[PDB]
């Protein structure tokens with residue numbers, strides 16, 4: 001009876017530890033399912049949820065008692081300094097870009113998309129006007145081209 | 148509702164097993180305090196009762212440990228439910244399959260015994276149709292890319308169509324934007340863009 | 344880490360002029376070995392007296408077996424909910440025209456009895472998976488004194504997973520084919536075909552950059568992608584710490 | 586009690602018994618004929634019983650794990666077993682699987698959804714005379730998707746689905762009195 | 774520990790086989806042991822020696 005009690009307690013210890021590890025593995029499996037749903041089946045906007053950089057795709061690969069994800073990501077590489085400005089005062093009115101930022105190479109100004117350098121000349125469709133150009137801080141003078 | 152019923156059944160079964168475990172002698176002459184205390188004086192009954200005490204205390208410890216495991220599981224489930232309520236009932240979730248198959252629109256909570264139920268209403272495109280596409284349109288040397296949507300041809304003409312629904316409209320300079328000459332793009336095709 | 348002061352000014356912004364298409368490999372456990380225990384064979388090996396004495400602990404042993412059965416069912420559930428997200432087993436098109444993207448190493452090899460890809464083959468070869476045994480060898484050559492034979496003779500069996508690794512590979516291949524032939528649309532209902540270049544254009548528009556830059560650099564991007572895959576093909580082939 | 590077999594062990598003259606990791610004696614020197622005999626348990630774990638639930642039928646199937654179907658009787662010691670256990674030891678419904686040998690269910694080449702999972706991609710069910718069938722599971726419908734560099738599929742309609750999903754939130758709060766449980770109402 | 778089992782697969786313990794015979798394997802020695810020399814001794818030893 002002493003032996004029976006001891007060995008039964010040993011089994012109870014083993015089962016308890018196995019339950020702990022099962023809970024850990026279940027948490028891992030739930031994370032893996034969420035990753036598959038949100039990164040393989042879609043494009044995740046969550047930062048660093050699926051790899052460093054901006055997530056593009058993910059490719060699952062089976063592994064022994066596990067899964068592997070190949071997070072393909074966009075990482076901007078070659079940066080360049082530029083002089084910016086929140087707005088452009090054309091003739092009293094303040095121009096704000098629709099998407100992107102105002103960037104100067106030293107002489108002129110262009111609107112450029114935020115994660116890539118593709119400047120284009122300032123235009124009334126690239127920007128939108130909002131009130132006079134006195135309240136904005138950092139605004140600078142330039143002309144906006146109008147087709 | 149197998150999950151909630153399973154939870155209730157697990158708790159009831161654990162309590163019933165704990166009651167059933169009082170029949171174990173744990174090495175003592177009997178599993179009943181009264182029999183031990185009547186057959187033996189405290190002289191010899193102290194050791195038997197101590198064995199019983201140790202065994203029953205260990206049984207309680209086992210039950211409490213299992214209850215802690217299940218409490219952690221239920222806490223994980225409850226945290227997921229709170230996140231769902233915050234991100235799907237209180238908002239519109241962009242996470243794919245987080246709240247139902249298809250594109251999530253709304254969610255409606257409903258209480259349930261020891262649990263919650265979500266009615267994820269979702270948009271599911273149903274009737275699909277083949278089409279011939281093209282990444283860009285070379286108008287007069289410049290390459291036109293759509294702002295939102297894709298270029299689609301029914302065989303004769305081309306239209307810009309939004310991505311998840313077939314609402315074609317004629318190609319126009321405001322629907323598209325130009326970027327450089329039309330030689331570097333692969334798959335580009337010839338057509339004219341209308342200009343008001 | 345490295346000390347790196349970043350320039351800051353009220354009228355100075357840094358803009359990228361290029362990019363790199365990185366591929367990062369990350370691993371997650373999904374299931375563990377299902378196990379079963381026989382109280383009688385473990386506690387009271389094959390003696391009848393000890394089993395008769397153990398009969399009064401049937402409640403304890405039923406509890407233990409119930410817990411382990413729950414664990415096993417949980418492992419099967421975990422594997423199913425991870426891999427069987429979609430129940431439409433898509434197959435890759437016979438022709439490989441994905442705008443220059445090379446998916447050879449992450450698609451099934453038809454020249455193998457198992458339907459695994461190259462990366463999968465490397466992954467399965469990088470893990471021993473030692474608990475696999477046939478009963479009869481333990482009854483026979485026992486002078487070697489294997490641990491698995493001791494576990495089996497003491498009632499500690501290891502149950503096999505429900506989903507064979509070939510089936511998991513089939514699920515993974517279906518997910519890959521749907522991903523590269525339909526994008527995200529197969530997850531939100533039916534699978535809607537789209538050329539891969541337009542798909543990656545959708546993704547680029549998603550991350551906040553215009554799609555034109557893709558088409559102006561498509562080949563380059565493809566090469567980068569392929570190169571990144573090549574890195575993985577060696578990173579999992581030399582070391583075993585991953 | 587157990588099963589005795591012959592083996593090879595080098596026993597020094599002052600040694601008679603041998604013990605394994607678990608401390609149970611595993612090798613013994615026979616005093617009469619000087620030789621070493623290995624003791625093994627006369628049973629083994631790995632027997633699983635498959636059944637549709639009672640209130641349906643009493644038929645069952647037996648999975649003997651990690652045993653070839655040729656060597657099932659010697660492994661299970663069917664000679665000493667009851668007559669009712671021997672019918673489930675060998676027959677015409679014997680089926681070999683990667684998990685082990687399945688007896689009492691006919692192998693079916695067709696594939697269905699999993700009703701009673703068995704292992705190694707095998708699932709069992711209760712067909713409609715009435716009997717237990719064992720089959721490889723179906724992972725889903727085969728559906729090749731058309732793909733071309735200049736072909737896109739666009740939806741023209743939609744369905745507003747409503748999906749019901751359930752989550753546990755709490756469980757029954759419980760309290761235990763040590764005194765009332767361990768030492769019911771005795772003062773000693 | 775129930776009279777009704779629902780649909781499924783169950784791991785089952787080992788009650789099926791029971792023993793039926795017994796074996797004894799002792800050395801074959803015929804010399805009866807000297808009981809008459811330790812018990813039927815004419816003289817015993819002093820407790821100190």
Ligand SMILES: *[C@@H]1O[C@H](CO)[C@@H](O[C@@H]2O[C@H](CO)[C@@H](O)[C@H](O)[C@H]2NC(C)=O)[C@H](O)[C@H]1NC(C)=O
Pocket residue numbers: 089090091092140141
């Ligand atoms: C940008 O444009 C504004 C007017 O559009 C300029 O404001 C003038 O500033 C001078 C003094 O520096 C005043 O005498 C003028 O009356 C202002 N013009 C108006 C219409 O009020 C401003 O100077 C320009 N910024 C720069 C750096 O040249």
Ligand SMILES: *[C@@H]1O[C@H](CO)[C@@H](O[C@@H]2O[C@H](CO)[C@@H](O)[C@H](O)[C@H]2NC(C)=O)[C@H](O)[C@H]1NC(C)=O
Pocket residue numbers: 285286287288336337
């Ligand atoms: C689409 O438009 C371009 C020009 O805008 C066409 O390119 C011409 O191709 C022919 C030979 O096939 C050349 O002789 C011309 O010099 C090209 N034109 C120019 C301005 O370079 C192109 O052929 C058109 N695509 C189709 C299918 O007709």
Ligand SMILES: *[C@@H]1O[C@H](CO)[C@@H](O[C@@H]2O[C@H](CO)[C@@H](O)[C@H](O)[C@H]2NC(C)=O)[C@H](O)[C@H]1NC(C)=O
Pocket residue numbers: 078360361362563566567
């Ligand atoms: C952007 O980065 C990529 C690679 O990091 C550059 O591609 C290489 O460019 C050099 C010279 O232009 C070539 O010798 C290499 O063969 C290119 N590598 C590949 C894989 O194609 C690219 O030039 C960079 N572009 C800019 C504007 O910086």
Ligand SMILES: *[C@@H]1O[C@H](CO)[C@@H](O[C@@H]2O[C@H](CO)[C@@H](O)[C@H](O)[C@H]2NC(C)=O)[C@H](O)[C@H]1NC(C)=O
Pocket residue numbers: 439445446447461
């Ligand atoms: C994709 O990458 C591989 C490796 O760079 C290319 O070469 C093949 O590599 C595998 C080794 O796994 C060999 O079995 C093949 O024989 C190689 N292909 C040839 C033609 O020899 C592979 O060609 C690339 N895919 C494409 C379409 O070019």
Ligand SMILES: CCCCC/C=C\C/C=C/CCCCCCCC(=O)O
Pocket residue numbers: 806807808811
């Ligand atoms: C020559 C001595 C051999 C010693 C053998 C040692 C152990 C095995 C025998 C043990 C018992 C010794 C005899 C005592 C008899 C008691 C019977 C009685 O009257 O109640």
Ligand SMILES: *[C@@H]1O[C@H](CO)[C@@H](O)[C@H](O)[C@H]1NC(C)=O
Pocket residue numbers: 079080081350
């Ligand atoms: C941008 O300007 C700062 C300060 O002049 C300098 O430290 C930094 O190196 C510049 N960025 C690059 C890519 O050179």
Ligand SMILES: *[C@@H]1O[C@H](CO)[C@@H](O)[C@H](O)[C@H]1NC(C)=O
Pocket residue numbers: 105106107108
């Ligand atoms: C800035 O851009 C304009 C237009 O491309 C160009 O004419 C000018 O030379 C550039 N000046 C400098 C300093 O880069």
Ligand SMILES: *[C@@H]1O[C@H](CO)[C@@H](O)[C@H](O)[C@H]1NC(C)=O
Pocket residue numbers: 137138353354
């Ligand atoms: C920016 O900072 C410099 C000094 O740090 C200052 O001279 C200048 O006026 C500031 N400009 C704005 C718009 O704040």
Ligand SMILES: *[C@@H]1O[C@H](CO)[C@@H](O)[C@H](O)[C@H]1NC(C)=O
Pocket residue numbers: 275276277731
């Ligand atoms: C689209 O084209 C492919 C091949 O012609 C075909 O298999 C598919 O059925 C078509 N889509 C629909 C909705 O019919």
Ligand SMILES: *[C@@H]1O[C@H](CO)[C@@H](O)[C@H](O)[C@H]1NC(C)=O
Pocket residue numbers: 301302303304
């Ligand atoms: C394509 O669309 C145009 C405009 O609606 C129509 O005139 C033409 O008949 C259509 N052709 C085909 C093959 O559908």
Ligand SMILES: *[C@@H]1O[C@H](CO)[C@@H](O)[C@H](O)[C@H]1NC(C)=O
Pocket residue numbers: 333334438440734735
């Ligand atoms: C598309 O594929 C077909 C054959 O599969 C080929 O003839 C055609 O040139 C390809 N077109 C483009 C833009 O890749």
Ligand SMILES: *[C@@H]1O[C@H](CO)[C@@H](O)[C@H](O)[C@H]1NC(C)=O
Pocket residue numbers: 616617618801
């Ligand atoms: C008796 O013992 C000897 C060695 O101890 C053995 O060889 C023999 O087989 C045994 N049996 C008989 C009948 O001698």
Ligand SMILES: *[C@@H]1O[C@H](CO)[C@@H](O)[C@H](O)[C@H]1NC(C)=O
Pocket residue numbers: 477653655
């Ligand atoms: C027993 O099974 C294993 C693997 O299935 C095989 O290697 C072995 O040859 C089999 N032995 C017999 C006698 O069938």
Ligand SMILES: *[C@@H]1O[C@H](CO)[C@@H](O)[C@H](O)[C@H]1NC(C)=O
Pocket residue numbers: 692693694
């Ligand atoms: C299943 O297929 C195999 C060969 O493909 C065949 O030998 C066997 O008879 C089939 N099963 C039945 C019940 O006919």
Ligand SMILES: *[C@@H]1O[C@H](CO)[C@@H](O)[C@H](O)[C@H]1NC(C)=O
Pocket residue numbers: 808809813
């Ligand atoms: C021991 O001594 C008594 C008296 O002489 C005698 O009856 C008996 O047989 C002897 N027993 C043994 C074992 O010598």
